[PDB]
Amino acid sequence: AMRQCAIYGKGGIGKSTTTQNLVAALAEMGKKVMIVGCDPKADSTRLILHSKAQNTIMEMAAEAGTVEDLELEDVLKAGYGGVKCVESGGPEPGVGCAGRGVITAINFLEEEGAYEDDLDFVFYDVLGDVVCGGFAMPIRENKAQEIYIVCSGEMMAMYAANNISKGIVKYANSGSVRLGGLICNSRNTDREDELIIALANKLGTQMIHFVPRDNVVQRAEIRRMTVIEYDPKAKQADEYRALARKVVDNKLLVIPNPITMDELEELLMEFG
Amino acid sequence: AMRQCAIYGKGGIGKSTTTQNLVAALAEMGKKVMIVGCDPKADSTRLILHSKAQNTIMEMAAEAGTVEDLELEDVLKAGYGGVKCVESGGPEPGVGCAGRGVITAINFLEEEGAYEDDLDFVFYDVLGDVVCGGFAMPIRENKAQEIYIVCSGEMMAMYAANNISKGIVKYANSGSVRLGGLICNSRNTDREDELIIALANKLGTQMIHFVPRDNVVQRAEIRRMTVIEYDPKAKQADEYRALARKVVDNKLLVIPNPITMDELEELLMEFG
Ligand SMILES: Nc1ncnc2c1ncn2[C@@H]1O[C@H](COP(=O)(O)OP(=O)(O)O)[C@@H](O)[C@H]1O
Ligand SMILES: Nc1ncnc2c1ncn2[C@@H]1O[C@H](COP(=O)(O)OP(=O)(O)O)[C@@H](O)[C@H]1O
Ligand SMILES: [Mg+2]
Ligand SMILES: [Mg+2]
Numbered sequence: 001a002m003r004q005c006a007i008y009g010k011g012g013i014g015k016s017t018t019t020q021n022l023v024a025a026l027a028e029m030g031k032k033v034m035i036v037g038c039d040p041k042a043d044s045t046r047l048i049l050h051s052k053a054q055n056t057i058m059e060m061a062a063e064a065g066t067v068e069d070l071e072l073e074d075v076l077k078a079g080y081g082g083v084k085c086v087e088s089g090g091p092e093p094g095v096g097c098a099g100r101g102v103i104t105a106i107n108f109l110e111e112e113g114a115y116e117d118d119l120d121f122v123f124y125d126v127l128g129d130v131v132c133g134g135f136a137m138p139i140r141e142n143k144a145q146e147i148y149i150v151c152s153g154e155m156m157a158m159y160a161a162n163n164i165s166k167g168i169v170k171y172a173n174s175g176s177v178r179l180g181g182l183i184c185n186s187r188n189t190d191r192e193d194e195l196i197i198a199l200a201n202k203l204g205t206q207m208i209h210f211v212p213r214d215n216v217v218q219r220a221e222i223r224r225m226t227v228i229e230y231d232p233k234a235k236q237a238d239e240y241r242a243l244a245r246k247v248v249d250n251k252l253l254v255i256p257n258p259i260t261m262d263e264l265e266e267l268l269m270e271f272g
Numbered sequence: 273a274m275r276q277c278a279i280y281g282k283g284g285i286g287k288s289t290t291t292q293n294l295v296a297a298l299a300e301m302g303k304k305v306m307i308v309g310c311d312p313k314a315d316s317t318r319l320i321l322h323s324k325a326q327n328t329i330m331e332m333a334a335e336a337g338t339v340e341d342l343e344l345e346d347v348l349k350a351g352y353g354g355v356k357c358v359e360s361g362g363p364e365p366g367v368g369c370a371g372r373g374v375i376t377a378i379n380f381l382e383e384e385g386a387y388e389d390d391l392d393f394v395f396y397d398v399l400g401d402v403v404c405g406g407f408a409m410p411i412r413e414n415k416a417q418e419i420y421i422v423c424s425g426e427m428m429a430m431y432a433a434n435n436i437s438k439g440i441v442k443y444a445n446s447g448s449v450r451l452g453g454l455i456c457n458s459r460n461t462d463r464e465d466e467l468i469i470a471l472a473n474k475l476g477t478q479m480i481h482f483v484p485r486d487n488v489v490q491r492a493e494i495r496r497m498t499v500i501e502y503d504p505k506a507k508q509a510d511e512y513r514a515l516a517r518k519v520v521d522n523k524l525l526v527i528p529n530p531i532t533m534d535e536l537e538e539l540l541m542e543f544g
Contacts, residue, residue: 010283011401012428040402041431052533093403094411094439097369129283129401130312131365139366156284159313167366222541261324269494 002119005180005247006038006144008128010160013150014185015039017217018243019125020047024228025237025244027081031120034076036109037087038102038138044125045085049077050224056089057108058101067104072112080229086114088134099127099134106143128160131167139167142175146253148208150183151199153192153271158199158264165203165256178253181208183243188213195271202263203256209243212236274391277452277519278310278416280400282432285422286457287311289489290515291397292319296500297509297516299353303392306348308381309359310374310410316397317357321349322496328361329380330373339376344384352501358386360406371399371406378415400432403439411439414447418525420480422455423471425464425543430471430536437475437528450525453480455515460485467543474535475528481515484508 007019016039023033024047037044043053057075061067076084088105090098106124109115115122124144127135138144149164151157161182168179184196184207193210200207220230227236279291288311295305296319309316315325329347333339348356360377362370378396381387387394396416399407410416421436423429433454440451456468456479465482472479492502499508 011432012282012426091404092438092442093435094408094442096404098402098404127401129399130370132363132368132370132405136366154284160283163365166364170364170366 002115002117002122003146004122004144005146005148006124006126006138007148007150008126008164009150010157011127011129013152013157014211015125015150016044017047017221018150018183018185018211019044019123021226021228021240022244022247023083023121023123024048024080024226025241026121026248027083028228028241029244032082032118033121033123034084034086034114034119036105036122036124037085038105038124038126038135040090040098040101040127042087042089045077045079045087046224047221047226048079048083048085050079054085054087056087056101057105058089058091061104067108070108072109072114076114080226097133099132099137102126102134103137106137128164131163136167139171139177142177145176146178146180148180148183148247150185151196152185152187153189153195154187155264155268158267161199161203162258162264166258168256169258172255179203179205179256180247180250180253181206183208184210186211186213191271195267198267198271202259202267204254205256206252208246208250209239211239211243274387274389274394275418276394276416277418277420278396278398278410279420279422280398280436281422282429283399283401285424285429286483287397287422288316289319289493290422290455290457290483291316291395293498293500293512294516294519295355295393295395296320296352296498297513298393298520299355300500300513301516304354304390305393305395306356306358306386306391308377308394308396309357310377310396310398310407312362312370312373312399314359314361317349317351317359318496319493319498320351320355320357322351326357326359328359328373329377330361330363333376339380342380344381344386348386352498369405371404371409374398374406375409378409400436403435408439411443411449414449417448418450418452420452420455420519422457423468424457424459425461425467425540426459427536427540430539433471433475434530434536438530440528441530444527451475451477451528452519452522452525453478455480456482458483458485463543467539470539470543474531474539476526477528478524480518480522481511483511483515
């Protein structure tokens with residue numbers, strides 16, 4: 001068995017920081033993990049690889065001729081804890097569908113047999129400001145069985161969570177894609193944990209963990225590291241370990257119940 | 273003559289708040305303005321209309337049969353200061369291209385002759401987390417002659433500004449789409465104005481105004497109003513008046529020079 005998880009959320013909310021730290025904590029426990037970057041920013045693996053970023057499948061296919069000229073052993077790169085990493089890439093702005101590289105990358109990984117039985121987890125890090133094209137592909141095509149949405153008390157972050165939830169509902173009649181939980185990535189605001197717990201309850205899920213705002217994240221990332229590797233004694237490292245444990249143990253996977261704009265505004269008004 | 277301006281930027285950065293307040297200030301001066309919402313969130317006109325949001329062209333076309341069954345006088349709605357408002361809408365998440373409604377809306381407005389000589393400004397409020405499909409249409413098809421990018425000292429907001437700038441460069445050989453400036457929408461961080469001035473200088477543009485973070489914005493928006501209407505004496509109202517004056521007087525419209533990721537990181541490291 002292997003569990004296929006996707007991390008969605010609005011831009012800049014903390015998807016890549018949360019995913020790479022969560023995965024580093026999993027590797028620290030002894031799990032074998034692959035990260036698939038599905039955001040055109042293409043910096044979803046840099047903290048595992050200690051790198052500037054990673055060259056993308058779209059780029060490598062173009063340099064090599066066709067995607068068929070690429071071998072898996074040439075594309076996947078291992079970093080901290082043996083975690084295997086790949087970036088989809090995407091077309092330049094104004095040219096074609098920004099999600100087109102996700103389709104190419106996931107199909108390549110499947111065909112080349114990247115999904116060996118000994119992987120325990122695959123994490124997709126997916127842009128979530130729009131749910132369409134290649135960004136909807138992990139849901140539409142049954143690749144991301146367990147979706148976790150990173151969010152905050154920010155209206156826009158909560159709206160994105162509701163929109164991703166609507167996409168999950170749209171494809172509920174096929175496949176097994178389900179909402180596994182919300183991850184609150186704190187803005188240091190009061191009762192923010194209670195706000196995201198309330199939103200999760202309205203959607204029918206749970207808030208799996210509250211990740212505090214902590215400057216150690218920036219200090220680790222300036223050095224191209226996860227907090228798990230940079231300072232394993234840090235309180236924030238233990239926060240990511242707790243998140244990873246709760247993902248491992250999570251048994252609640254639901255078809256969510258999206259809410260109205262009126263319900264979302266009422267939520268902010270009450271906790272604010 | 274009429275000036276066609278588009279406001280781009282990452283999600284949640286302040287596009288709709290800035291656009292509606294800027295436009296209210298223009299109307300307060302006596303300019304005739306239309307706002308075209310080009311973000312699927314479809315709340316880009318609510319503060320002018322005092323409304324929950326606005327029913328979208330996509331919705332109205334479906335209820336009426338075809339877009340040809342709609343008349344312009346039925347779709348455009350006027351609010352504060354006579355400002356005319358329309359929302360594109362878009363398909364539900366997971367269904368089709370999130371930008372598809374922008375194409376339908378702009379073509380409808382052009383065909384129905386919404387661009388009367390007596391309009392002084394048209395503002396498009398455009399999602400900018402991806403630059404593709406209908407969201408690239410205002411650039412690709414020469415609709416948004418002057419682009420202003422709302423941003424902040426946030427890495428993701430600055431990255432989005434660079435990506436939008438790359439889209440402008442891609443279409444530089446046709447049409448007249450140009451970058452008019454950056455608008456800094458403050459995060460209450462130190463030297464944030466200097467950071468965005470530096471980014472603008474590297475792109476070849478200017479930072480047209482620094483908009484402070486001010487709680488009066490939330491108090492106005494809870495009441496579905498611009499600050500200009502809610503509290504015309506507020507310091508923040510004068511900030512939006514200054515922004516509007518500087519847009520009116522702006523003569524610098526450039527093909528921007530996008531920067532590397534290394535340059536962008538160096539910018540944050542220096543000012544941080
Ligand atoms: N819990 C946290 N504490 C401090 N900084 C954080 C935290 N989470 C994210 N960040 C910072 O926020 C910024 C955006 O995070 P990132 O994971 O790149 O967002 P996304 O992948 O969703 O666009 C990064 O600079 C990151 O270091
Ligand atoms: N200068 C400001 N001061 C205080 N709050 C602001 C300011 N600019 C924006 N906001 C708030 O930020 C949130 C997002 O703004 P919005 O214009 O809706 O973003 P976008 O249209 O880019 O998604 C809104 O709640 C808005 O009231
Ligand atoms: Mg990311
Ligand atoms: Mg908006």
